[PDB]
Amino acid sequence: ILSTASVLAFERKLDPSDALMSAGAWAQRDASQEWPAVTVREKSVRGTISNRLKTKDRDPAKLDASIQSPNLQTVDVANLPSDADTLKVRFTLRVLGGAGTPSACNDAAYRDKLLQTVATYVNDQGFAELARRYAHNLANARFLWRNRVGAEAVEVRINHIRQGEVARAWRFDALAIGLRDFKADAELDALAELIASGLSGSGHVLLEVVAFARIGDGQEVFPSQELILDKGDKKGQKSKTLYSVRDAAAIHSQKIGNALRTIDTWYPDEDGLGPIAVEPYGSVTSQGKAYRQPKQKLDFYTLLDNWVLRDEAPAVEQQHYVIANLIRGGVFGEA
Amino acid sequence: ILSTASVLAFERKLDPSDALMSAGAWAQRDASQEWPAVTVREKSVRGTISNRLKTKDRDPAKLDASIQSPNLQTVDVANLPSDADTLKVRFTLRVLGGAGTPSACNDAAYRDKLLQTVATYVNDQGFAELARRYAHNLANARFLWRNRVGAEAVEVRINHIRQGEVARAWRFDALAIGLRDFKADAELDALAELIASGLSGSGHVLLEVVAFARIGDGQEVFPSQELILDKGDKKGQKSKTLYSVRDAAAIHSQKIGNALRTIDTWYPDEDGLGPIAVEPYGSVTSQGKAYRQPKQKLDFYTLLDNWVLRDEAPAVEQQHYVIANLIRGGVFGEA
Amino acid sequence: TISKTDIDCYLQTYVVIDPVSNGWQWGIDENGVGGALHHGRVEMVEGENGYFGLRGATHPTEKEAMAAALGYLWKCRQDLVAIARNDAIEAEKYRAKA
Amino acid sequence: VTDPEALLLLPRLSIQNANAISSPLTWGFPSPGAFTGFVHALQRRVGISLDIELDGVGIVCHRFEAQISQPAGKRTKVFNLTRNPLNRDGSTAAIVEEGRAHLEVSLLLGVHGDGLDDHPAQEIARQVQEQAGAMRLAGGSILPWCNERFPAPNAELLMLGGSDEQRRKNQRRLTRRLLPGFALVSREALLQQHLETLRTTLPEATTLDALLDLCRINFEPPWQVRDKPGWLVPIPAGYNALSPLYLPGEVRNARDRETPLRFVENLFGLGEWLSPHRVAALSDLLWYHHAEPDKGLYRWSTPRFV
C-alpha cells in the first residue's frame, strides 16, 4: 500500500560555517588574509517611546510622563573601523552529496521508493538547475544580508579547495549578478557544474566563499543576532546581543545557509517578489506569509507524497523544489 | 536438564574511552600533541515550522500566525576554528580477554557448559575473524560518525602502548579501507593478531587510536549529544547540548564502542545494506528495524540456548556473532 | 487493586499551579500542601540562565499543567508516589471501616 | 495582671531535650505553661531574696530542632526515642514515646518590686541568669555556654521611661537583640471570632472545629488555598477542671500532702508566632497565669496583647 515512513530525517547537504566578518580597505582585497576582525562592542542607547499606544496610554500627561522616564539600553554593535570601508565576510561551504538518502527511516519499502524517485530525478535531470541557483546565491552575495543593501561594490571570490590549496578560483561582481534573475553566464556555469558534481557524489567539493563589500568608513555591519538573558534591571538591559565566535563578529551558519537556499522562484504566488528560501510550507519570516500552503497542492509534503507514494510526479519546477528540500534536510515525519 | 541461568551478566570486553576531539591544521598531524581542543559553544537559532501538520492546523490564517511566532532556541554547537581544517579524535582502547566468563551467573552447570562451549570455539577457531573485523572498524574511522561523511581525507593512527610508550605504531588510510568490506591487508592482519592476543587473554593490549579528518576551515564537527533538562521557557530553550569532558568536545565511549562493534555482516537480511552493530536482536535504531528477529532462529538468545543447552552449534558465522555478543557484554537472563 | 487516580487524589497536594500571564506553570510542593503560604515548602529549581521558578512548562490550561505535574511525579519522584500510595490504601481501608 | 516595672531579658538559652509533646493534641514547641512555670520557679528560687516579683514571660525561640523523623513512604512524622534501662529480669521495658526538642529561646521576664531600687539592674539580671543556669525549661537542660566566642549577657530594661522617645528607643534596642526568633502570643479573640464566622456559615459549630479550621490548609474550589493572617498554631492554653477540689491529705499519691489536688484536662487555644517588632511594645507579649480556682479554668495567656 506504501504509506509514508513515520520518521524521515535528512542530513544537511551544503554545510556552511560561521561567516567571519573582518575589515579593511578596497584595492587591498588581494592581501586580505591578515585583515583585522570586526569586533562586537557595546554602546548605550536611549530612546523615547515610539510604539503604538492602545488608547489607554494616549493621555497627554501620561505620555509626557512616559517620555520623561525613558528606556536605557546597551546594545552590542559591530562597525567597521574609521580607516576601513571594505567588509570581508568569509565562510567555507561543503557540498556533500547523497541527497535522497535519509539519515533515519523506519519503512524500508518507503526508503527504496524514495531512493528510486530521487535517482529517477537525477537520471532525468541532475542537480543542474539547483546548482545553478546555489551558485548564483554564492555569486551574488545574498549571504551578506543587510551588509549588501547599501554597498557601493560587492565582490565575491569563491575558491574550490583541493588537497590543500585553490584548485579553481572564481571572482564575481555581486551587484551585476542581481538578487532576482537566475540568468546564464560562463563562470557561473563552471561553478554550477562543480556544485552539481558535489551534490551527485562525483567529487569532494569544499568551497571558500569570501565576499568584500564597499560599505564606507566606520559604517555599521550586521552580524547575526543572539537572544537575550533578561534577569536584571531595565537600565543594564542588553537589549541586543550579536554573534561572535572568538572576539570576532560572525554571521550564524544557518543564516548563510538560508541565503544560499533562496532559489525558490516556483511558488504559486507572484514572481514580482523574487525567490524565497526553500522551506516546507515555503515561508518567509519577514513577510509573515507562508507561500506553498497545504490548501493548494504545492507544499513539500503533498508534492513528495504524490511523487513517492502514488507516482503523481509534479512539474519539473516543483520537483526542483522537492529535491531542494531534500538537499535542505529536515525532520519530515508524523508521530 | 541444564536449564538457563536466571542471571547472566558479562563484563564488556573492548573498553574504549571517551573520544576527545581537538583541532588543527593538516600536514602537522605529527606535531598534534598540543593541538587546541574543540570547544562546545552556544549559538542562537530561529526557524519557522517545517514539521508535518495533522489536517487540523492547515488553516492558512493559522499557518501564517504560527510562522509569525517562530521558535527561538539556543543550541550547543561545536566547530573547528576558522584557521584549522583537521579534526583529531583521540581515544584509548583496552582489549581484556576472558570473553566467556560471566560476571554473574546462578547455575554453575550452565556456567561450566558455557565456558566449555566458548573454549571449544576458541580452540576450533580463535578470535581471528572477530579481531580482524574490530581491527577494520578501528582502521576505517567508523568512530568518526558524522565527522567522516564529508571528510576529504581521513587517516587513523593506532599505537600499541606497552610499559610506557609505543611498542608498535600503525597508520591507516581510512577512506581506502571502506565502511562495508572486511578485506585483507598486511598491517590490518598485524592489528588483528594484536587484538586477538588481547581477546584470548594471552597479553595486555592497550591501543591509543587517533583519527584525523580533513573537514574544512571552521566547519561543524559533531560530538555526541546529551539530553536536556526541560524545566523552563521555550525561547532560551537550550534545545541541544553536546558532550564535553572538560571544556573540550567529546564523543561518548559507548558510541565509539558501537562503531567498533559494527562487524555483523551475517544477519539474515540483505548484506548489501552493510554491517550492523552486534546486538542481541540485532537492531539499528536509526532504521527502526530489528534484523535477527527471534522468529528466524538467528537472534543471540536462541543461538546461545541451542549452542549451550542442547548442543546444536550453528554455522561459524552465527557463532562469531554469539562470541561477539559475549565480547560485547550485556545483562542476559530472565527474571 | 488501588487505581491510579486514587493515588493522584493524594499526589495532587504535592503540586502547585502558579498563575502567570501567559498560562499556568506547574511546580512541586515538597511539604505536600499545594504551595501554601506558611506551611508550604515549595521546590524551586535552578535552570539554564538565572531561572529560579517552578519546575514546569507554561501550559495553556490548568487541566494540562496539573496533568504534566502528575506525569512528572509518576515518572521521576517515586517517594511522593509511595506517600500517595499509602494514603490511598489507608483511605480505602477507612471506607472499608467507616 | 499587673504591669511590669522593668523587663528582664534572659538571652538565648539552649535547652537540649525539651518536651516536644505540648499536649495530647499538639506537638512541636513546648507549652507556654512550661515557661510560666519556669519563671514562677525562678521567682520561688531567687526572686524572694532579691525582693522582686518575676511575673510574665515572653517566649522567642531563635532556634528549634525537634528530634523527629519522617518514615519511608509516610507523610507524617514519628519521634526519635531513648533506650531506657532494662527491667529486673533483663527484658526491654515498654516504650513510652516522649518527644525531645532542642530549643534556643530568650525569655523576657516582667520584674516588679522594691528590689529594683535596692540592687543594681545587672546584679539581679546576673543572679537570675546564674540561677537559671542550674534549671530546666521544659524538661530539658539549660546549656550554660562554655568556651564559645562570648557569653550572651543579660539586660534588665526598666520599662519606666523618662520620655516616650527613649522608651521606644530601648524597646527597639531590646527587639534588635531578640530578633532572629519569633515571639509567641495568644490569639483567642481571633479564635472566638473565627468560631462566630464559622457559626454564621454552619450552625452548631464547636471552637475545637474552629481551631482545627485555623490549623488546616484549606483547598478552595474556583483552585486556591485559603490564606491565613499569621502562623496560627494550636497551643494548650491551660487546664479545665474534671474533679472537685480535693483536700491536701485526702487524695492518694499526690506530689505533696499540703496542696489541694484537682484532676484537670487541657484547654487548647490558639497561638500566633509573630516577629518581635510587630508588637511595638515588648511589655506586652508576656504570658501570665489566670487561675479562678473556684470554677476550674487554670489557664495562661498573654493579656494586654492588643
Task: Please tell me the number of Cα atoms within 13 Å of D299 on its side-chain side.
Answer: 20
Place of cell 572498524: B137
The span from the CA of B114 to the CA of B3, in Å, is: 12
The span from the CA of A334 to the CA of A106, in Å, is: 12
Instruction: Enumerate neighbours of C (3 or more CB pairs within 8 A).
Output: A, B, D
| Contacts of A27 by beta carbon, 8 Å cutoff, 6+ apart | none
Using a CB-CB distance cutoff of 8 angstroms, which residues of chain C are in contact with residue B233?
Answer: 51, 58
| First-to-last C-alpha distance (Å) of chain D | 14
Using a CB-CB distance cutoff of 8 angstroms, which residues of chain C are in contact with residue A231?
Answer: 49-50
Give the residue among C16, C35, B233 at the shortest CA–CA distance from A231. B233
Grid cell digits, residue B106: 546462578
Radius of gyration of chain D from Cα atoms?
21
CA dihedral defined by A258, A261, A262, A263, rounded to 10 degrees? -170
Grid cell digits, residue D13: 538559652
Whether residue A196 contacts residue A131, with contact meaning beta carbons closer than 8 Å, is answered with: yes
Instruction: Enumerate neighbours of B (3 or more CB pairs within 8 A).
Output: A, C
| Contacts of A21 by beta carbon, 8 Å cutoff, 6+ apart | A37, A38, A78, A87, A88, A89, A90, A147, A221, A223, A248, A249, A250, A251
Do D213 and D230 lie in a common domain?
A: yes
Which letter, b or e, does each residue of D199-210 get, where b requires 16 or more Cβ atoms within 10 Å of its Cβ? eeeeeebebeeb
Grid cell digits, residue D180: 532572629
Q: Whole domain around residue D236: which residue ranges?
A: 182-302
Give the DSSP letter string of A230-294.
--S-SSS---B-B-BSSSSBEE-HHHHHHHHSEEE--SSS-TTS--EE--SS-EETTTTEESS-T
- Among residues D181, D212, D244, the one where a domain terminates is D181
Task: Please tell me the number of Cα atoms within 13 Å of A182 on its side-chain side.
Answer: 22
Instruction: Return the DSSP state at B200.
Output: T
| φ and ψ of B269, to 5 deg | -80, -170
Listed by start position, the domains of chain A span 1-11+99-126+263-335, 12-98+127-262
Beta bridge partners of B93: B16, B207
Angle C4-11/C78-97 helices, nearest 10 degrees? 110
Smallest CA–CA separation between A60 and chain B, in Å?
Answer: 33
CB-nearest partner of A18 from B46, B79, B149: B79
Give the residue among D160, D71, D144 at the shortest CA–CA distance from D112. D160
Beta bridge partners of D236: D268
For D44, counting Cβ atoms within 10 Å of its Cβ (0-12 exposed, 13-18 middle, 19+ buried), the class is exposed
CB–CB of D73 and C86 under 8 A?
yes
Q: Of chain B residues 221-240, which have a CB less than 8 A from chain C?
A: 229-233, 236, 238
CB–CB of B229 and C53 under 8 A?
no
Grid cell digits, residue D8: 528582664
Do D164 and D199 lie in a common domain?
A: no
Beta bridge partners of A210: A90, A157
The secondary structure of D200-256, three-state, reads HHCCCCCHHHHHHHHHCCCEECCCEECCCCCCCCEEEEEEEECCCCCCCCCCCCCCC
Task: Classify the phi-psi angles of D290: left when phi > 0, otherwise alpha if psi is within -120 to 50, otherwise beta.
Answer: beta
Do D129 and D203 lie in a common domain?
A: no
**Touch between A and D (at least 3 CB pairs under 8 Å):** no
CB-nearest partner of C34 from D74, D225, D227: D225
Instruction: Return the DSSP state at B58.
Output: -
How many domains, chain D? 2
Do D158 and D23 lie in a common domain?
A: yes
The span from the CA of D192 to the CA of B132, in Å, is: 89
Residue in chain A closest to C48 (alpha carbons) equals: A229
**Touch between A and B (at least 3 CB pairs under 8 Å):** yes
Q: Tell me the CA distances in angstroms from A236 to A39, A46, A70, A312, D148, one per residue in order.
A: 21, 12, 13, 58, 45
- Measured between CB atoms, does B218 come within 8 Å of chain C? no
CB-nearest partner of B60 from A208, A288, A295: A295
Do D83 and D153 lie in a common domain?
A: yes
The span from the CA of B57 to the CA of D126, in Å, is: 81
Using a CB-CB distance cutoff of 8 angstroms, which residues of chain B are in contact with residue C51?
Answer: 231-233, 236
Q: Tally the residues of chain D.
A: 306
Q: Tally the residues of chain B.
A: 335
Q: Tell me the CA distances in angstroms from B222 to A12, A16, A97, B81, B150, one per residue in order.
A: 13, 14, 18, 14, 12
Count CB-CB contacts under 10 A for residue D178: 24
Using a CB-CB distance cutoff of 8 angstroms, which residues of chain C are in contact with residue A229?
Answer: 49-50
Place of cell 536509526: B286
Whether residue A225 contacts residue A241, with contact meaning beta carbons closer than 8 Å, is answered with: yes
Do D229 and D99 lie in a common domain?
A: no
Using a CB-CB distance cutoff of 8 angstroms, which residues of chain B are in contact with residue C18?
Answer: none
CB–CB of C56 and B233 under 8 A?
no
CB–CB of B229 and C57 under 8 A?
no
Do D49 and D126 lie in a common domain?
A: yes
Beta bridge partners of D300: D289
Using a CB-CB distance cutoff of 8 angstroms, which residues of chain A are in contact with residue C50?
Answer: 229, 231
| Contacts of A322 by beta carbon, 8 Å cutoff, 6+ apart | A300, A303, A304, A307, A314
Give the residue among A1, A314, A308, A263 at the shortest CA–CA distance from A139. A263
- Measured between CB atoms, does D220 come within 8 Å of chain C? no
Do D11 and D61 lie in a common domain?
A: yes
Whether residue A298 contacts residue A280, with contact meaning beta carbons closer than 8 Å, is answered with: no
Count CB-CB contacts under 10 A for residue D189: 11
- Among residues D162, D181, D200, the one where a domain terminates is D181
Helices within B200-266 (DSSP H only): 253-260
For C14, counting Cβ atoms within 10 Å of its Cβ (0-12 exposed, 13-18 middle, 19+ buried), the class is buried
Place of cell 525582693: D51
Using a CB-CB distance cutoff of 8 angstroms, which residues of chain C are in contact with residue B230?
Answer: 57
Task: Please tell me the number of Cα atoms within 13 Å of B107 on its side-chain side.
Answer: 17
Task: Please tell me the number of Cα atoms within 13 Å of C48 on its side-chain side.
Answer: 22
- Measured between CB atoms, does D255 come within 8 Å of chain C? no
The span from the CA of A330 to the CA of A300, in Å, is: 11
The span from the CA of D116 to the CA of B140, in Å, is: 97
Place of cell 490569639: D187
Whether residue A148 contacts residue A213, with contact meaning beta carbons closer than 8 Å, is answered with: yes
Whether residue B136 contacts residue B177, with contact meaning beta carbons closer than 8 Å, is answered with: yes
Give the residue among A232, C19, C53, C68 at the shortest CA–CA distance from B232. C53
Q: How many contacts (CB atoms, under 8 Å) link B and C?
A: 18
Task: Please tell me the number of Cα atoms within 13 Å of A120 on its side-chain side.
Answer: 13
Task: Please tell me the number of Cα atoms within 13 Å of A280 on its side-chain side.
Answer: 21
Mutate to test the interface with A, among C49, C51, C52 (most CBs of A within 10 A): C49
